[PDB]
Fold this sequence. Notes:
By secondary structure, the chain is α+β, with helices and mostly antiparallel strands. The protein contains two helices and two strands. The radius of gyration is 21 Å and the shape is flat. The PDB classes it as transcription.
Amino acid sequence: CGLDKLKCLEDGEDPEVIPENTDLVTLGVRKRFLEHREETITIDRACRQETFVYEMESHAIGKKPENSADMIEEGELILSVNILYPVIFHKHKEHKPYQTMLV
DNA sequence: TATCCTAACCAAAAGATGATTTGATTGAAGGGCTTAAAATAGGTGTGACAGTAACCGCTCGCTTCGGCAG
């Protein structure tokens, strides 16, 4: 069960380029997405679809507190709560204006 | 420079503008009436009739069962 049997990618390979030596339909669709975004009018490193989630994940994921009293108990429940804003679009119903709080 | 404004333009939220599709309304017609009359021909149930029926504060008079009489 060693990883040499599974690691088609070497540890020194960047994720910014699609490996052409693949048979994946997913990577084919990814190539279709990337090819039409390489022109001077379309090439950029802007937001993909959203930014907030990773920014507030990496800012806190895997970190530990500076005080002992602020320690999460082992096995403590983590609850994800979405709080909607008072200013609703009142034009769309699929998506909502909300902020997600972890308690 | 690190960073920004926001003229003119690109990506996305929202904010809006007219053409088209679907939920909803209805105009007209199938239909099935009305009393008004005049008429012969009719069937019986039923609803009066009638009957029994039943159910639903003070002061006198009168009486008895023993304690001596005979």
